[PDB]
Amino acid sequence: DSKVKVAVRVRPMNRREIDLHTKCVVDVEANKVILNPINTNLDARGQPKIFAYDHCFWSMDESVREKYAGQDDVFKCLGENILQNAFDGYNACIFAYGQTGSGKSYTMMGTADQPGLIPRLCSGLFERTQKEENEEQSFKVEVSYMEIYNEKVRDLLDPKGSRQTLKVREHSVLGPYVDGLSKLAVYSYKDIESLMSEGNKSRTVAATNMNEESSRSHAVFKITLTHTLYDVKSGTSGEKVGKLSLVDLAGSERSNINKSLTTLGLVISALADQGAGKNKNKFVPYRDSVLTWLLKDSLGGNSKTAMVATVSPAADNYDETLSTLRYADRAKHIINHAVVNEDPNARIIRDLREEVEKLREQLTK
Amino acid sequence: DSKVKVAVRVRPMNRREIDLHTKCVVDVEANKVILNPINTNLDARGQPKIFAYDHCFWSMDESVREKYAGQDDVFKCLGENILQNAFDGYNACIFAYGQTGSGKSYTMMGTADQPGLIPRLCSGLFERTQKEENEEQSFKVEVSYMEIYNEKVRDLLDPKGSRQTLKVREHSVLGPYVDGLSKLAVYSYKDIESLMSEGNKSRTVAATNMNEESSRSHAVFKITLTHTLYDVKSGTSGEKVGKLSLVDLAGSERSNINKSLTTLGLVISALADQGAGKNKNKFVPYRDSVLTWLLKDSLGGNSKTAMVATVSPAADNYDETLSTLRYADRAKHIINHAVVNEDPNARIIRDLREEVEKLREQLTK
Ligand SMILES: Nc1ncnc2c1ncn2[C@@H]1O[C@H](COP(=O)(O)OP(=O)(O)O)[C@@H](O)[C@H]1O
Ligand SMILES: Nc1ncnc2c1ncn2[C@@H]1O[C@H](COP(=O)(O)OP(=O)(O)O)[C@@H](O)[C@H]1O
Ligand SMILES: [Mg+2]
Ligand SMILES: [Mg+2]
């Protein structure tokens, strides 16, 4: 049904890079990222490398106004389509990918000063449900917020704070799920903000003494939007469910602390190959890690998915940037199979009524 | 499908009645209530009047142990069947009826020292969902808590506390409902207790200066139990919904402050008549008051309903007791039509598959 949408975001030079006048090797021109060489005297390897994507966000300098992508520009190019996907009854996923320090969290959650995709999405969601609820349609919103570290799943909304690990299980009806994960109804922005906030503090309390290892953890924020449509002249109603998954991955740079990230690289490569008609018979190793298992639908399954690859423009990060740019490039060839999530009984009934009519007129003979 | 179940509960003498050695005119023998005369010299009107009910709770004296019904006895004879009705996917209603001071609130909600039907029901509900959840079945619980006074509906769980009044509307899919009423998910006893508690304080803050008028208000506490059954070998699932309505009516004794109570008396009388085959063509005046409108299903509709008629045993209350005893008597002839509340599409599909098979073998000719 659709291809994975890919955006790249170039963060500003950090404070060390400004002190040192570190050179910028990343240029953005419309939807092209140009990775310029570090070693300017080479006949290959010292040439610019040019990549094309669905979206490019140059976020290097607030001053350059004809070029700079702030937080709301990201939201208007990526967030709004994803919110519309959920309101249409599709599962939708945005995940941020890139080396530690390149801007994954700033993009997904942002700061109190510069809220990112998740709080903007939350606000717009409740704005829209408030404006569209009436006697033909109602809405229910649920939230889950989990962390994956060292292949163990924790509930960031846990009431206790034991930080105990949750089993991941397969279910013929639900699919892969986290057995025990809180799923909480929310009724306004402020409900979902208080959950966002408790989960973010549990991400940061998990990072107090283990700062190097908090760059190795994945965070998944999940909104379930249940749209009820009332067929008022037939006295019936039905549900369409869209699930919004906002994913803040572990740092992509160089025991099984990285099993999920590695497995994700494999999953992306296999799905990209398959989109280009290679290795069509090779099964995708979703099952080999907790993260790719839990998010199997988001990549090559029943989901409308966008990737925000985040990169440093600094010469010192060239190799990690190239690799991020290459994965994003592969990712834009992944074919997804998003369908509207409504009850199958209605289609079964329509088909059966059609078969009844076919039989009835066959009987006329 | 079922008749309205009726219990009577006889409260103990209050402090004034003990001071004055007020005589007891109510006796209980098995399921019979005997209303003995006040004027002992009369040839009718000064004879005992004997009524039979489904249950009789003599709650006059904790000391008499072979006879006394405490709060858990009430819950085991009435609460447990109602909880089982909800778990089976029926709507279920308990309402308390009787003069001010006779024990309606003590029976429905009780005191911190003697919790009544509602907290006991809540606790047992979450006990049962915790023990029965597994991979074939999950549960969702929602609560609403409203007050009706002078034909106006207020939300006892309102976050603001404006005490603003809510419109009651008709809906072809939902039925009569309160437009704007909070309906909140709860996940443990303590969630639903904090809501119970905020609602009870909003009942009592509404009674600070208006104590005589708080005896004129109705309170409705509503739990929605959504039972999901997972058909794991077919990869499908479905919902059964039971709604639990616990109703604490206004005082039954002698402008439209009493419109709902009067209309309820009419509704009970018409439905009792109809059960005994009288006035079969006379429509029941559900629509003439907010309370009977909102609870139309509980009386003569899709509900398993029990009435707790509460009475004073004191001679001074004879006339009000007789009238309470008479309404309870009428109420036990009300026929209800409770069905299991599941999705109708499954029956439509079964019938259509049967029709397909009938046609297919007719075609063999
Ligand atoms: N586009 C941006 N604009 C301004 N500041 C940014 C941007 N991206 C990142 N930062 C800052 O850089 C720091 C590291 O970014 P962060 O999002 O934590 O990276 P990651 O989560 O990928 O490790 C943060 O303090 C953030 O405020
Ligand atoms: N069965 C009972 N046992 C002990 N005390 C009771 C009983 N019924 C009522 N009471 C007490 O009598 C008082 C009035 O009862 P209440 O339930 O408020 O009556 P109502 O709600 O019908 O006006 C309460 O303070 C309650 O504690
Ligand atoms: Mg981060
Ligand atoms: Mg009361």
Author numbering:
A (entry chain A), B (entry chain A): 3 to 44, 48 to 259, 274 to 384
What does the paper say about this structure?
UNC-104/KIF1A belongs to the kinesin-3 subfamily, which can dimerize and can be found as an inactive monomer or a processive homodimer. The current model demonstrates that the activation of KIF1A involves the relief of its autoinhibition, a regulatory mechanism found in other kinesins. Previous studies showed that the motor domain of kinesin-3 family member KIF13B could interact with both NC and CC1 to form a compact self-folded monomer for autoinhibition.
As expected, in comparison to the autoinhibited wild type, both the T192Y and L397F mutations significantly restored the ATPase activity of the MD-NC-CC1 fragment, while the T408E mutation only moderately restored it. Because we could not obtain sufficient quantity and quality of UNC-104 protein for structural characterization, to further investigate the mechanism underlying the mutation-induced activation, we performed crystal screening of the three mutants of the KIF13B MD-NC-CC1 fragment. We successfully crystallized the T192Y-MD-NC-CC1 mutant and determined its structure by the molecular replacement method. In the structure of the T192Y-MD-NC-CC1 mutant, we could trace the electron densities of the motor domain (with bound ADP-Mg2+) and NC, but not of CC1, possibly due to the intrinsic flexibility of CC1 upon dissociation from the motor domain. Although only one molecule was found in the asymmetric unit of the crystal, a MD-NC dimer could be formed by a crystallographic two-fold symmetry axis. This demonstrates that the T192Y-MD-NC-CC1 mutant can indeed adopt an active dimeric conformation, mediated by the NC coiled-coil. Upon superimposition, the structure of the T192Y-MD-NC-CC1 mutant was very similar to that of the active MD-NC dimer, which also supports the notion that this is the active conformation of the T192Y-MD-NC-CC1 mutant. In the autoinhibited conformation of the wild type MD-NC-CC1, T192 sits in the interaction interface between the motor domain and CC1b, while in the T192Y-MD-NC-CC1 mutant, the bulky aromatic sidechain of Y192 protrudes from the motor domain. The T192Y mutation is therefore likely to introduce a steric hindrance that could prevent CC1b from interacting with the motor domain, which would ultimately activate the motor for processive movement.
